[PDB]
Design a protein around this ligand. Structure first.
Ligand SMILES: [Zn+2]
Length: 73
């Protein structure tokens, strides 16, 4: 089922803390989702799909997450 918070985080492999949903529907820790997308040029840690919601910042020469991460309460 979508949105479950009891699966391993696909980034850090631990119990998810501060869950959020990625553009691909998978759940990760909030800082894990942010850091993975920034560090991997906007690619999903589960599917390696190039995500629509990540944008390249020409000033910092780094990727940022503009849309596509949603927190779970
Ligand atoms: Zn994590």
């Amino acid at each position: 089922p979508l949105g479950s918070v009891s699966e391993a985080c696909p980034v850090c492999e631990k119990t998810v803390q501060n869950p959020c949903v990625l553009e691909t529907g998978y759940v990760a820790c909030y800082p894990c989702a942010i850091s993975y997308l920034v560090n991997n040029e906007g690619h999903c840690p589960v599917t390696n799909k190039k995500l629509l919601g990540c944008t390249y910042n020409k000033h910092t020469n780094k990727w940022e997450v503009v849309t596509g991460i949603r927190k779970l309460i």
